[PDB]
Amino acid sequence: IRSLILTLDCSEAMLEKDLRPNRHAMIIQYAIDFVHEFFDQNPISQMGIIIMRNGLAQLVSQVSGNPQDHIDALKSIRKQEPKGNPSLQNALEMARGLLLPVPAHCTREVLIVFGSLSTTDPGDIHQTIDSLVSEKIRVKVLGLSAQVAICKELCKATNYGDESFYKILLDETHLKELFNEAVTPXXXXXXXXXXXXXXXXXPTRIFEDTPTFCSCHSKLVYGGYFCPNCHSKVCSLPTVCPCCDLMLILXXXXXXXXXXXXXXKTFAEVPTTEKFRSEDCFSCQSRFPXXXXXXXXXXXXXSRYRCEDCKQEFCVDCDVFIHEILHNCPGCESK
Amino acid sequence: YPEQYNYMCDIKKTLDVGGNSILEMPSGTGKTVSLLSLTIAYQMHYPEHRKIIYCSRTMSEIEKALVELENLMDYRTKELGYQEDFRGLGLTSRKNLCLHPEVSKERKGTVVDEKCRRMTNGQAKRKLEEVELCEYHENLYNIEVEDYLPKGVFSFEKLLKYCEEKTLCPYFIVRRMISLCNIIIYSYHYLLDPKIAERVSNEVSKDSIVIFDEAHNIDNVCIESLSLDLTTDALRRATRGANALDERISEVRKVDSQKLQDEYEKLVQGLXXXXXXXXXXXXXXXXXXXXXXXXXXXXXXXXXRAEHFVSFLKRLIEYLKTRMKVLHVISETPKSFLQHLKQLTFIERKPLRFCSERLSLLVRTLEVTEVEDFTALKDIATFATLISTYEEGFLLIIEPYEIAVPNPIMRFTCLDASIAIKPVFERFSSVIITSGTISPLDMYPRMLNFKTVLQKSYAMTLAKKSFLPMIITKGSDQVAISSRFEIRNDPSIVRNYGSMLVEFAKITPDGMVVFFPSYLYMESIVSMWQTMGILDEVWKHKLILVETPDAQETSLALETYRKACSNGRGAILLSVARGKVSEGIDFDHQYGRTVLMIGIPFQYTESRILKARLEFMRENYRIRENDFLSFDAMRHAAQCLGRVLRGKDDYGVMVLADRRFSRKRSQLPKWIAQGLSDADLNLSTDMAISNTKQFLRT
Numbered sequence A: 001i002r003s004l005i006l007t008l009d010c011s012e013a014m015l016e017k018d019l020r021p022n023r024h025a026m027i028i029q030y031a032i033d034f035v036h037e038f039f040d041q042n043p044i045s046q047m048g049i050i051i052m053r054n055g056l057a058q059l060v061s062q063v064s065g066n067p068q069d070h071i072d073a074l075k076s077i078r079k080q081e082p083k084g085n086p087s088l089q090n091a092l093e094m095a096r097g098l099l100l101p102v103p104a105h106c107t108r109e110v111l112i113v114f115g116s117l118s119t120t121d122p123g124d125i126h127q128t129i130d131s132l133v134s135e136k137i138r139v140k141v142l143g144l145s146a147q148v149a150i151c152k153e154l155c156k157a158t159n160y161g162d163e164s165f166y167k168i169l170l171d172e173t174h175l176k177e178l179f180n181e182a183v184t185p186x187x188x189x190x191x192x193x194x195x196x197x198x199x200x201x202x203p204t205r206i207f208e209d210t211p212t213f214c215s216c217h218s219k220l221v222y223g224g225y226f227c228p229n230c231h232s233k234v235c236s237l238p239t240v241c242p243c244c245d246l247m248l249i250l251x252x253x254x255x256x257x258x259x260x261x262x263x264x265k266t267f268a269e270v271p272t273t274e275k276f277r278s279e280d281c282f283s284c285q286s287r288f289p290x291x292x293x294x295x296x297x298x299x300x301x302x303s304r305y306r307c308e309d310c311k312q313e314f315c316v317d318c319d320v321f322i323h324e325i326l327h328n329c330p331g332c333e334s335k
Numbered sequence B: 001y002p003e004q005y006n007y008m009c010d011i012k013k014t015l016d017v018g019g020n021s022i023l024e025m026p027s028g029t030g031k032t033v034s035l036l037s038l039t040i041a042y043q044m045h046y047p048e049h050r051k052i053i054y055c056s057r058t059m060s061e062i063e064k065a066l067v068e069l070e071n072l073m074d075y076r077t078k079e080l081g082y083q084e085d086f087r088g089l090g091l092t093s094r095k096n097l098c099l100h101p102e103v104s105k106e107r108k109g110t111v112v113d114e115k116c117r118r119m120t121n122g123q124a125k126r127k128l129e130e131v132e133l134c135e136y137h138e139n140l141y142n143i144e145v146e147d148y149l150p151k152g153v154f155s156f157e158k159l160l161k162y163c164e165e166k167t168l169c170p171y172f173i174v175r176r177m178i179s180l181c182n183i184i185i186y187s188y189h190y191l192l193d194p195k196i197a198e199r200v201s202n203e204v205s206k207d208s209i210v211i212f213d214e215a216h217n218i219d220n221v222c223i224e225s226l227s228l229d230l231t232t233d234a235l236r237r238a239t240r241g242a243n244a245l246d247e248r249i250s251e252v253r254k255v256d257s258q259k260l261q262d263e264y265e266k267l268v269q270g271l272x273x274x275x276x277x278x279x280x281x282x283x284x285x286x287x288x289x290x291x292x293x294x295x296x297x298x299x300x301x302x303x304x305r306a307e308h309f310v311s312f313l314k315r316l317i318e319y320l321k322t323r324m325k326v327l328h329v330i331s332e333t334p335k336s337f338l339q340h341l342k343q344l345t346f347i348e349r350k351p352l353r354f355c356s357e358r359l360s361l362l363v364r365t366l367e368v369t370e371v372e373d374f375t376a377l378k379d380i381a382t383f384a385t386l387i388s389t390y391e392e393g394f395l396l397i398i399e400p401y402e403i404a405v406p407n408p409i410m411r412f413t414c415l416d417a418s419i420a421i422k423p424v425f426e427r428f429s430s431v432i433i434t435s436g437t438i439s440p441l442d443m444y445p446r447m448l449n450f451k452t453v454l455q456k457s458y459a460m461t462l463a464k465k466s467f468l469p470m471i472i473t474k475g476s477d478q479v480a481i482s483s484r485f486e487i488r489n490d491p492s493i494v495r496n497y498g499s500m501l502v503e504f505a506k507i508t509p510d511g512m513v514v515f516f517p518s519y520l521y522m523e524s525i526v527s528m529w530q531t532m533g534i535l536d537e538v539w540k541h542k543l544i545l546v547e548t549p550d551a552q553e554t555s556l557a558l559e560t561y562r563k564a565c566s567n568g569r570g571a572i573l574l575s576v577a578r579g580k581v582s583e584g585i586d587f588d589h590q591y592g593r594t595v596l597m598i599g600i601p602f603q604y605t606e607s608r609i610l611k612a613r614l615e616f617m618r619e620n621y622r623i624r625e626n627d628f629l630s631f632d633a634m635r636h637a638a639q640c641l642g643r644v645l646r647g648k649d650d651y652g653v654m655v656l657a658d659r660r661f662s663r664k665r666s667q668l669p670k671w672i673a674q675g676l677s678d679a680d681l682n683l684s685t686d687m688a689i690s691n692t693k694q695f696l697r698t
């Protein structure tokens, strides 16, 4: 569904001592964690890692849905020293070369981790910006410390003229938060066009391994997925079958679809003196006063959470928990 | 916005009551206030009563006033849907408002008015007894051209293109449209010009509102109205000019002497008044401002002709050569110099009336006039008009001999500036005086005596977006003392200061503009700096304003700055606060987000002019040895402070060195004094806080 291109800054400016021990190692590690979370909340999505080193853009992880390739590609960067200077234009041109074969019904995202305060580009970057906006490519830049006007014009131009995507990071925790923000999709207002895709297989799991089989690598396996079209037994991933080009999805597509469908209804905070109901939680059992800062003014007040779709009481930890995972409110299942 | 609305109320009450007001506007947010306040103030009375007389110091402010005036026209025409009599006349440079010198001359010098006088004389000569007319003429005085402006705004650029399309000349359109009483946007060198202020004063016909914009260099303009340096070469040009006058005497006495006798009779009968009342569209000469001079009944050399004027003129220039060939140090009192001249030869105190008339007579007898000789005759004529009149505060001075070859110079020192500004307080009223680089605003009631009201800036909010720190400790506190001398001392300490500039420029690579008190430090650090990594890592290239500034060089440096900042590169702008181009166009990240100041501004001392004006102001206001090292430097530093402020939506930081800055005020007096190394990390945090508070305060 999504096609994100992770462009990490790997130049001499990354050798400075801001993060611990340096910016490069923390960006690599947090990039590995970003690969984990991204492939955990986006199963049938694509990733591609490019680095900006030695004044050039170097593709280190081809566009694929297997996280292990990105993990190894990120492990190879921390064993070398980030030298040279960053090149935004070359990275955006190569990102274009990786996002052009992507179908129009799939989003094209480019996430740039920019630590330096200056880039080294051959040609005019504004023409590359015009090319990015023309072919519809959403660009998000996580810059370090001071702002760059080119990043403002790029993030604003690549998002329907709206500026709210050039995120400034000031610490490791902030960078973690931005990473987390790139996991979640962005249902923007769009420009109203047509959408649909067709042909998505569902596999049958083969447990046989006495003679083994493989139609994508011709190697030994312990069992493999079955294509309902070309009838090939390949390595197991819910992505595209490489023998006739169609998906092999299962309950994962339903999972991410329902995750994108979650309304996440925050329960209204109503004091016990206003609800006139005993302290109760419907997901567990709560006899704990929430408020008690003062004497009888706060202890006898407390806070009861309310789901209005069923008029039920809950405590805060369960509102947070059902906001993180699970469908909202067990009381909405009983009528 | 309420802050600017308070200034709107102040402009309203001062326009309705007071005759003059000293209004202090915040830098970057006070240009669009008076432009609408004046128009609405004109509409509340009745549509056509007083007119906007906006006065700026540069042409960029004139263009900004023109485009903002167009924003006023669109603003008033998009909210009501009714079309009114449009105003707005752009009075710019003569070379930039003419089309013929770009077709054949291909020059942008100051002699375009001479060629325009050749074309005008061609028109007059093809309308009298006979070069071509020009490009297009004889239709610039008609009603249609007089109505092309009130029906549609055509100012400067729109007037240049409109004249290039409609086949017209913009000079006569503007000149004929000064009497139309539109919104004229000219500079201070035109309101107080000993050659332009007379005609403008006769065409505007007074009864308007004058707007002194950025009125902080008014004393500088009043000083620049005189002081002409006689550097021995003007004596040779005056000698060759006298020889040319003798040749012209032989020519008019050779065959055609009837016109000289007829014009001579016009002088004996109707004098200078009739001579200037008969001629129309003829080139004029210089004059010590006739409205300020007030001298009538100009007799033509005690009723004499031209041979006597060139004889007494040869004696006068020879006396000048005699007074310029002396020992070395000598000061002149203009009265004692006139008395000594009378002791050498009697000529009385009337060579002024003898120049203003004889120059016009020669013009009326000349058809092929040489430019250098006539120019030298105009210089000697001005010197005569200013040794014959205007003596109170005037001080003739001779430059000492310092080798003695490059030396014979004679400069005249002007008089009190209050005299020069004076006529506007009888011609006009409710003259609004606005400036964003005035602090304190008490040196304008003191120096230049006039009764007015004082209104200071009352706008100060969002202090977290206007980082204003100052640097005192440079790691050793040894460059802040050596950077205050007229001549630099200990070059190694200056090299250490430059190294501190390399470290500071490396810490904050996001557009840097550095201002220097003089070009000596720049030329000393640019010769051999022992370092260049800032140009090799963060700045790619450096921008240096030449000690001899050039228009195309400065333009290519500014465009290079905008393109360098629009490519994510940045460049250090090593400029001088005392140099050319004070700038004023910001409101963008293309300008230097961080501005560096090398100490405090300094004025060149050990000069006879600073001692003459020093003792003169000492006798006037008794502000001796105190205001010439804090007021002028305060204005020069405020010229750099005004570039940092560019609206509350933008941010910036300006680093001022030296502790002496605490002795002077500043715009937005919220400053913290700490070291420079600490200011590196402080600015490192400000470059993120300024980026975080934006979306939080919105």
Ligand code: SF4
Pocket (backbone or CB within 6 Å): B098, B099, B100, B101, B115, B116, B117, B119, B120, B134, B135, B137, B169, B170, B171, B172
């Ligand atoms: S009429 Fe106009 S174009 Fe011709 S010389 Fe005069 S100013 Fe220039």
Ligand SMILES: [Zn+2]
Pocket (backbone or CB within 6 Å): A227, A228, A229, A230, A231, A232, A241, A242, A243, A244, A245, A246
């Ligand atoms: Zn298949």
Ligand SMILES: [Zn+2]
Pocket (backbone or CB within 6 Å): A281, A282, A283, A284, A285, A286, A314, A315, A316, A317, A318
């Ligand atoms: Zn609970």
Ligand SMILES: [Zn+2]
Pocket (backbone or CB within 6 Å): A307, A308, A309, A310, A311, A312, A328, A329, A330, A331, A332
């Ligand atoms: Zn519910």
